[PDB]
Point group: C3
Chain length 72, copies 3
Amino acid sequence: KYELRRALEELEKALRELKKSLDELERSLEELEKNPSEDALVENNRLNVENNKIIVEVLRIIAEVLKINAKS
Amino acid sequence: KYELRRALEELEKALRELKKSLDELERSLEELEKNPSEDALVENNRLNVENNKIIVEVLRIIAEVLKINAKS
Amino acid sequence: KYELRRALEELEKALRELKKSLDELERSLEELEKNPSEDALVENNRLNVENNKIIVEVLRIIAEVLKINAKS
């Protein structure tokens, strides 16, 4: 079952990165609301796109797990 | 199988919240495009971050379901 | 097992759309950082919301797969 175990471990790793990304995104939003500006908006958008990027990777891993389970 | 049932029910609940969040996000975007401004942009970013926040929660639940299925 | 196969095929299709959306989102971000403005920010937000929209659809499909596996 190592194929599945490895996939779930990679999922765990990606979710940890996703959480860190989300934390930074939320911090940026709080600062943006306090002191808004074009620069702060661009910064926040950057971090939002980065969060979406990791979400896409997490979804890829989940799809892989589902395919492993299906051939099983 | 209650562990799995409960997880899938929680998934359903989170997805409903996610849909409401997305609806509000889309409404905000439409208003932003009609009448853009720094304030409207900050508001839209707020709702986008909130949507990402719920997505992360949904992904957590999915990971839990996959772990339940794996020990099964 | 066609129910599951069809769901996984639909998942694959949605993930391909998600990747294209993400690529366009990243391109927009790069241009935004190079030449920022209110218009560019609105454009980037539009593409970010669109990416979230597809993510929600992908999560729906994943939930369906998990429900198929559960009744199985």
